Design a protein around this ligand. Structure first.
Ligand SMILES: *[C@@H]1O[C@H](CO)[C@@H](O[C@@H]2O[C@H](CO)[C@@H](O[C@@H]3O[C@H](CO)[C@@H](O)[C@H](O)[C@@H]3O)[C@H](O)[C@H]2NC(C)=O)[C@H](O)[C@H]1NC(C)=O
Ligand SMILES: *[C@@H]1O[C@H](CO)[C@@H](O[C@@H]2O[C@H](CO)[C@@H](O[C@@H]3O[C@H](CO)[C@@H](O)[C@H](O)[C@@H]3O)[C@H](O)[C@H]2NC(C)=O)[C@H](O)[C@H]1NC(C)=O
Ligand SMILES: *[C@@H]1O[C@H](CO)[C@@H](O[C@@H]2O[C@H](CO)[C@@H](O[C@@H]3O[C@H](CO)[C@@H](O)[C@H](O)[C@@H]3O)[C@H](O)[C@H]2NC(C)=O)[C@H](O)[C@H]1NC(C)=O
Ligand SMILES: *[C@@H]1O[C@H](CO)[C@@H](O[C@@H]2O[C@H](CO)[C@@H](O[C@@H]3O[C@H](CO)[C@@H](O)[C@H](O)[C@@H]3O)[C@H](O)[C@H]2NC(C)=O)[C@H](O)[C@H]1NC(C)=O
Lengths: 121, 202, 106, 224, 224, 202, 121, 106
């Protein structure tokens, strides 16, 4: 079965670069891309990144551009996102997302990770 | 507004599926991607269309892998026939709502199909002449490397052998020439491990 | 960028009642997707097209609406603290969800 | 098939449209060159007679003519090199509501070749047929007739074989078109079984710059 | 003679140039209407391919095409009424130093008639020949053959007579072209002496919208 | 730049000369005046050219009277033939040094030629029929006023008589008809002082 | 023979309108036009008018326009010119002129009158 | 308007001498005409084209010159107080003559 596993919650300093990992199992990582979404109680949830493992092309939100850079590894089948300047109210849950195989459900995010909580001082 | 296909050519046997990539950049919010086929006899045949919004569209042996955020479109052909030797073009169709929208084509990919069956056969050679023109025909041979030649003291011209695929699945090759003499000309074709002349088969 | 505003901030639905939640959009959107979330869990796939059902949801859920101001309807409530939280559309390059609607069972 | 026009430099050229559309509103013209992607040149309206060309093209070079009710012709005013290539007539399909404008129908494409002062050396396919070899050892002397089109300047040529009847197309496997110093050479060969060897075989060549301006039909006499 | 084109409204029309000039630089086009003076419309250059039209005319309506090395054709994009009339191809003559540009050679002129949705009633000359009367009293029964072209829409028509040989033109004195409610009628008559009455007489009618698109040749059988 | 010919039409016998006037206004310092002929079969034939600077130019039967200060050009035709029935156009040719200069034509004058010989002759009448079509031919008559008629109880259609000039110098006229009956139709033409039917001449 | 006769010299007042006559004999007046030239010792001679009897069209010099108006009479075959404001140094000889029959001599004035002298106070 | 200037204001020609008089023009003129005048008489027609003679003048008179600066030449003087006085051109709408050249017999 398709499954995505994410790293646990990490306590972070006001200024640092944090790498969040997401590993996909049950399907071929090369064909499908991984979206990254951030959910916060005040702003809700918004799409913050998208990375295609096959070619490495990345799409960012305009507000989140520059803040987050994503990388992928097909051998380990894991996607990492880097975060900086985390003290600026960036304490939120981070979710992976993947569309249904063959895009059956349109643009709906069929498969989600369990979510990693990031809290900053 | 820009479309690229970096694959110059691809070669696959009959029963193996092939994939063709198309990477594009566009400022249009909603658009379509069209796939077209250009036969060696120049003609554009519409294969498939993938909308930016709808799901993955599958038609016949052609399937499309669509990546909206990465903006990538791949066409997969499964169990291709021998007629899939044409060029394949990916066109970033502008929103087709109007009748005036153009298609932004790209440098297409070339697909070549090799025969599936792999038996070994011994070529048969023949020599056919008209006036001063001589043609050596080698028929029913599987090994591509033949290096067919002809023997003649006087050499006027010579043309590169033409090798194509017989409908039986094997290869058929033909040579030509404009040799001065007619009676003395004799062909000879090298099998993948042997060699045969035109003295036999007579 | 479309705000994807949602009219109902909160509801007090009870079993035996059919309710509707609207998800208005500033600009017209071709198709509309919905997500349901539950506490201590990630949002579920749920609806995948206007007036469609996905991932094996109860048949009580349904969708409707024109190109603007899509909606969702449920016929009966049965021990679900949240029938449908969030929206989603990708007619625009910035894919935005919305604030979310929460309906407490009463 | 595919036609061709070989008008010299500094001379108007005419390209026809093979589309059969009875309610077309806009007709687009595309240009495809070797090693380059197809690019639209202009599109001519039907409800109104003006035609709109893309940026970067000098006005007045391209014109659209309608000799009949539905027959569009693109006319190039002055020809220079780099204007060669395949010209495609295109038009959007039906089904706007569902399968929204599913296809952009394309024409067969006309090849335009721009030369200097013409070849003037009687460039036209000059066949040289070959007789079947003695092959009673194998395939009961099926033989292989050859249609060797020797000297012709324009690249395009359509060689196909037929029996005394023209109903069914015979399967003939082509060679290649080599570039002799100033011309092009192509050849076809066909294997016919003994059960049908009694029939005379016609090799039909379709080519521009052909004598009488018709599809040449070389005849191979039958052998029992 | 004078040709004619009868393309309907809102349809491109083509007019050929009858001039035979091997070194022309500019070719001018003139329009003559009933009750109005001829006025130049445009002139197309030869050394360079652009054409210059006079003020007051919408650009793109008139185009000049050169299918051959020296063959100029004027193409009207969209036709409306008031665009009818005789179009003349003109070009300046030789002799610039002495008898300075003595003439502006004019073409035979092509008549353009713009109608609405065509006549659609098979408009083509429908002859009805008459037999000579018994006239042995005077002119030894010379007789007068009549070629009565009955129903044809385009105004222009050329009726001339010939014997079994076509070397010499017979002198036939025309009638007039009356305007029947929707068509035009014309008739010719010829008096032939008894010394030549033994010959069959052909009435040749040149007309556009003619069946087979050739000069019709009605035959009057000979009478001794 | 403007040219006018106020003479709508002119009629002269064969041996009498005719004159055609052309009044123009131009701001050009040096120019040319061209005279053109438009036959009933539409065709422009160049008759004569008069330069603004040179003398009066005479060619054949055509002479030109040129008034530079008054800016007037007159064409005189002396002893005109029967072929001078065409329209005559006066064109203020712009300086012909360039190849691009147009001609400013004017509303041309119409010339009609009457026959010279004046003998008196008695017309001869005949009736010729095909099916239901009847044509009455009156031949070799000088008097223009004939008022030819036909007798018939039933009148389907009728066409105006066509009168032209015979090469002998006389007039020939023809009538037509689509009368219901064929045998009973009889013609009748009125001489300038008499009248004759088709009962005679039979 | 072609001949042109002109009126004799007339003494004139500083302000008046004077009519100078010119009669042509020996040819047809209708076909050919009459030019009028003024010769003065200081300014030489210049062309001051031209009248065509057939249609009455008149051509004037720009400097002499308005000053002189010409009229013709075919029945009397005589051309008249009117002059006004004659006190302004307009004491000069006036000549008629006609080109050679058929314009044989180009634009040369082949036939001249004897000239009428006009003197003003 | 062309001034039609004349270089020689006066000459003192004598019999047995051939003289030339030039009539320069500000602008080019196609053809050039000349007139001769005598006291108590109207100007005579004289020359009617460049290098031409008219009205029966002695053959000694002749013309020459290009499109600008035409001239006239006489071979011998014989009891003529004025061989040629004035010029004329009509290449321009204002037809102007010129000052005139007078040559006293000496
Ligand atoms: C070698 O090839 C040449 C070139 O095709 C052959 O010449 C051609 O022969 C055919 C008959 O085999 C000729 O067709 C017929 O010829 C005559 C004369 O016109 C007449 O019976 C028919 O009208 C018909 O055309 C063909 O014309 C001829 N071509 C030329 C250019 O001469 C030649 O026969 C071949 N040699 C052998 C040994 O097969
Ligand atoms: C294309 O045309 C050129 C024109 O120069 C051809 O050059 C030809 O060169 C050969 C020698 O290489 C000259 O002699 C010929 O040689 C062989 C036999 O040795 C044979 O082809 C001929 O019988 C002839 O003797 C030949 O005259 C010359 N051609 C000329 C000057 O017109 C060149 O070979 C051609 N290229 C091709 C056909 O691929
Ligand atoms: C009255 O006029 C009509 C119309 O022309 C005459 O009919 C035509 O008659 C001629 C012969 O006089 C026919 O030509 C020949 O007819 C037949 C059938 O085609 C054949 O021998 C020849 O091929 C040739 O065409 C002509 O076809 C015919 N026209 C029609 C429309 O029927 C008629 O004969 C005239 N009547 C009299 C009494 O003269
Ligand atoms: C042009 O076409 C019009 C169409 O209306 C013609 O009108 C025609 O009028 C007549 C009566 O004047 C109708 O009857 C006809 O009368 C005579 C005999 O009396 C004869 O021509 C026919 O046998 C018929 O009976 C006729 O039906 C009618 N035509 C129609 C309705 O199509 C008009 O006469 C024509 N003008 C011409 C030929 O100059």
């Amino acid at each position: 079965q398709v499954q995505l596993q994410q790293s646990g919650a990490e306590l972070v300093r006001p200024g640092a670069s944090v790498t969040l990992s997401c590993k996909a199992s049950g399907y071929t990582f090369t064909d499908y891309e991984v979206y990254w979404v951030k959910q916060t109680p005040v702003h809700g949830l918004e799409w913050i990144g998208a990375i295609d493992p096959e070619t490495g092309r990345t799409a960012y939100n305009q507000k989140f551009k520059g803040k987050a850079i994503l990388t992928t590894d097909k051998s380990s089948s894991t996607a990492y996102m880097a975060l900086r300047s985390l003290t600026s109210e960036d304490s939120a849950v981070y979710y992976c997302a993947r569309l249904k195989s063959g895009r059956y459900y349109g643009d709906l995010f069929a498969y989600w990770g369990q979510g990693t909580l990031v809290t900053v001082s | 507004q820009k479309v690229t296909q970096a694959q110059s050519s691809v070669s696959m046997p009959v029963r193996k599926a092939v994939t063709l990539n198309c990477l594009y950049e566009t400022s249009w919010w909603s658009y379509y991607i069209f796939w077209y086929k250009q036969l060696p006899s120049k003609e554009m045949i519409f294969l498939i269309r993938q909308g930016s919004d709808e799901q993955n569209a599958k038609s016949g042996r052609y399937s499309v892998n669509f990546k909206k955020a990465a903006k990538s479109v791949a066409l997969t052909i499964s169990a291709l026939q021998l007629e899939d030797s044409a060029k394949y073009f990916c066109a970033l169709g502008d929103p087709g709502g109007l009748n005036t929208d153009k298609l932004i084509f790209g440098k297409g990919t070339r697909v070549t199909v090799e025969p599936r069956s792999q038996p070994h056969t011994k070529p048969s050679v023949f020599v056919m002449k008209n006036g001063t023109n001589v043609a050596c025909l080698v028929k029913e041979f599987y090994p591509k490397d033949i290096r067919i030649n002809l023997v003649s003291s006087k050499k006027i011209t010579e043309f590169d052998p033409a090798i194509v695929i017989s409908p039986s699945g094997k290869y058929n090759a033909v040579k030509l020439g404009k040799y001065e003499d007619s009676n003395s000309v004799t062909c000879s074709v090298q099998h993948d491990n042997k060699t045969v002349h035109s003295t036999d088969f007579e | 960028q479309i705000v994807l505003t949602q009219s109902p901030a909160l509801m007090s639905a009870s079993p035996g009642e059919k309710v509707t939640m609207t998800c208005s959009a500033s600009s017209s959107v071709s198709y509309m997707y919905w997500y349901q979330q539950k506490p201590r869990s990630s949002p579920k796939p749920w609806i995948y097209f206007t007036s469609n059902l996905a991932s094996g949801v109860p048949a009580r859920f349904s969708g409707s609406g024109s190109g603007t101001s899509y909606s969702l309807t449920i016929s009966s409530m049965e021990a679900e603290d949240a029938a449908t939280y969030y929206c989603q559309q990708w007619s625009s390059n910035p894919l935005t969800f919305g604030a979310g609607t929460k309906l407490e069972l009463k | 098939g595919t036609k061709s026009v070989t008008r010299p430099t500094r001379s108007s050229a005419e390209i026809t449209c093979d589309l059969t559309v009875i309610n077309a509103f806009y007709i687009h013209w595309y240009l495809h060159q070797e090693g380059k992607a197809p690019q639209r040149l202009l599109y001519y309206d039907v409800s109104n007679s003006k035609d709109v060309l893309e940026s970067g093209l000098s006005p007045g070079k391209y014109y659209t003519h309608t000799p009949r009710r539905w027959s569009w012709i693109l006319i190039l005013r002055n020809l220079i090199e780099n204007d060669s290539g395949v010209y495609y007539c295109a038009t959007w399909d039906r089904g706007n509501p569902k399968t929204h404008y599913y296809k952009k129908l394309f024409g067969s494409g006309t090849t335009l070749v721009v030369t200097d002062k013409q070849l003037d050396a009687d460039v036209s396919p000059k066949p040289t047929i070959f007789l079947p070899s003695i092959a009673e050892t194998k395939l009961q002397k099926a033989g292989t007739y050859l249609c060797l089109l020797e000297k012709f300047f324009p690249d395009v040529i359509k060689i196909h074989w037929q029996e005394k009847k023209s109903n069914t197309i015979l399967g003939s496997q082509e060679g290649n078109t080599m570039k002799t110093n100033d011309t092009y050479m192509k050849f076809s060969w066909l294997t016919v079984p003994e059960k049908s060897l009694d029939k005379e075989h016609r090799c039909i060549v379709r080519h521009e710059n052909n004598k009488n301006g018709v599809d040449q039909e070389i005849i191979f006499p039958p052998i029992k």
